[PDB]
């Protein structure tokens, strides 16, 4: 009645102190651990990040241009889908971030992903039911303050919101989406009618019995895709199969809810999975029954997992423990001393401790090896790169 609503705080003042002191120590250690570390505080936290595939080294400049696809998270005010332009300094204060474009968006951006075949086409997941599609070359350079959201395409099929989003790298226009409605929708944005901005799901997969958390196309076989849900099950589907309620394979992947999955860009067989049981599981398509390996070290739920686009044996995972772990499969099962075994398994390459809140997403840079961008719930975004000294002898 008298007391105000406080969206800060709103924090745990005890945990805050611990987090901050661990951050101070991390910061003075950065010169040892990183060849590059850049930080920026966004006005609103971003739940999503993805590098655009374009890079350029402008003549006469001592840096390189890179682009990020970001989003906004406000429940009170106007949301935007944003493409940021960044200067990453040449290896031979530091750095710069700017806005290439900013697009009026209804509700927060749960996830934003670009179409590999046409990088200026971007799909987004809304707090509503529709997933949206924007062509950013057809939107004004600066957004209208009125806040009107005019997506180039609205895709219908879901009853609730979601996060899982995946373009097909081999089938242009084919998009997958996961949702809290227990389903996984499929669209072909090339077909539909002549007008206007509304297309229907081509398929609605109902194999799951709970909130399906993530979805991903196979990077090599254009008809296979994986799904992951709160029923603790990893399912693998086939599009040319005429049954949308029973997958080709069904796996009891974790003891808790499964949050994310990522196919290896080099091996057509292996797959990784992140769960609420604080572990990442390795999977091979030949035999799903056998869980190849289990990555232990995360102290809390894992929400994102991504393979390196340069090194086939490199894996990264982030979660609620505010840490981003980098794994090297080539060091699995390898022997180690007792003092080293106390820090974690041999495949644990690197623990990124620059974030002071949950990491919502991260993205491997496709043009600069070992460069990553991660975003946390406390408005921070970090573009960083592990010290060469650590991965290369």
């Amino acid at each position: 009645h008298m007391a105000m609503a406080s969206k800060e705080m709103f924090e745990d003042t005890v945990e805050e102190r611990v987090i901050n002191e661990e951050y101070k120590i991390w910061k003075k250690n950065t010169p040892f651990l990183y060849d590059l570390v850049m930080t920026h505080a966004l006005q609103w936290p971003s739940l999503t990040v993805q590098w655009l595939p374009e890079v350029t080294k402008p003549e006469g400049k001592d840096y390189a241009l890179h682009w990020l696809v970001l989003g906004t998270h406000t429940s009170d005010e106007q949301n935007h889908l944003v493409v940021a332009r960044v200067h990453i300094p040449n290896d031979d204060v530091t750095g710069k971030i700017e806005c290439e474009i900013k697009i009026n968006h209804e509700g927060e951006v749960n996830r934003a992903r670009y179409m590999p075949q046409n990088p200026h086409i971007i799909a987004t997941k809304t707090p509503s039911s529709d997933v949206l599609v924007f062509d950013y070359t057809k939107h004004p350079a600066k957004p209208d303050p009125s806040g009107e959201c005019n997506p180039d395409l609205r895709l219908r099929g879901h009853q609730k919101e979601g996060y899982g989003l995946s373009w097909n790298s081999n089938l242009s226009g084919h998009l997958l989406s996961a949702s809290d409605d227990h389903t996984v929708c499929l669209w072909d944005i090339n077909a539909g009618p002549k007008e206007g901005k509304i297309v229907d799901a081509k398929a609605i997969f109902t194999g799951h019995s709970a909130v399906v958390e993530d979805v991903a196309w196979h990077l090599l076989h254009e008809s296979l895709f994986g799904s992951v849900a709160d029923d603790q099950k990893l399912m693998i589907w086939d599009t040319r199969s005429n049954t949308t309620s029973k997958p080709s394979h069904l796996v009891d992947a974790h003891t808790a809810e499964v949050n994310c999955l990522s196919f290896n860009p080099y091996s057509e067989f292996i797959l990784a999975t992140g769960s609420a049981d604080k572990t990442v599981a390795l999977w091979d398509l030949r035999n799903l029954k056998l869980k190849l390996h289990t990555f232990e070290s995360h102290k809390d739920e894992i929400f994102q997992v991504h393979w390196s686009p340069h090194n086939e044996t490199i894996l990264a995972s982030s979660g609620t423990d505010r840490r981003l772990n980098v794994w090297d499969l080539s060091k699995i099962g390898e022997e180690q001393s007792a003092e080293d075994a106390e820090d974690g398994p041999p495949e644990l390459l690197f623990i990124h401790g620059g974030h002071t809140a949950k990491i919502s997403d991260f993205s491997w840079n496709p043009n600069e090896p070992w460069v990553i961008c991660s975003v946390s719930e406390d408005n921070i975004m970090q573009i960083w790169q592990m010290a060469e000294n650590i991965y290369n002898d």
């Binding site: 840490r323 820090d343 010290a387």
Partner: peptide
């Protein structure tokens, strides 16, 4: 031996402790 070889195990340990 060289000095990098001396600080390689130290840095790699620091990396796995965050």
């Amino acid at each position: 031996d060289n000095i990098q070889g001396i600080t390689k195990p130290a840095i790699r340990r620091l990396a796995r402790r965050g």
